[PDB]
């Protein structure tokens, strides 16, 4: 059911609230709302067994 989003790039977290990404990970995107991520241009999601925020430009739909 949940839409497919793919990490375009590696992302190394700067905090425990940030999601680590590796290029080509399928990322479960949980919100695009800045009021939920707390940081304009950041989304919330789950990958790697962690939930957290990442910069929105790091994933693409499909």
Residue numbers in the entry: 41 to 102
Question: Please, what does the article write about this entry?
Answer:
MLK3, also known as MAP3K11, is a serine/threonine protein kinase involved in regulating the JNK, p38, and ERK pathways. It is composed of several modules: an SH3 domain, a kinase domain, tandem leucine zippers, a Cdc42/Rac interactive binding (CRIB) motif, several linker regions, and a proline-rich C-terminal tail. The SH3 domain has been implicated in the autoinhibition of the kinase domain through an intramolecular interaction via a nonconsensus single proline motif located between the leucine zipper and CRIB motif in the full-length MLK3 protein. The overall structure reveals a five-stranded antiparallel β-barrel, a characteristic of all known SH3 domains, and three loops (RT, n-Src, and 310 helix), commonly involved in the recognition of both proline-rich and nonproline ligands.
We solved the X-ray structure of the apo MLK3 SH3(44–103) domain at 1.5-Å resolution and refined it to an Rwork/Rfree of 18.6%/21.7%. The final model has all residues in the allowed region of the Ramachandran plot. The sequence alignment of the SH3 domain of MLK3 and five other human SH3 domains (Src, Fyn, Eps8, p67phox, and Grb2) revealed that the n-Src loop sequence of MLK3 SH3 contains an elongated insert of five residues. The residues that extend the MLK3 n-Src loop form a 310 helix, which is not commonly present in SH3 domains. Comparison of the unbound and ligand-bound structures of MLK3 SH3 domain revealed a closed and open conformation of the n-Src loop, respectively. As modeled in Fig. 5B, the closed conformation of the loop precludes the peptide from the groove. In particular, residues Ile-77 and Ser-78, which participate in the 310-helical structure, as well as the following Gly-79 undergo dramatic spatial movements required to facilitate binding of MIP to the SH3 domain of MLK3 as demonstrated by the change of positions of the α-carbons in these residues.
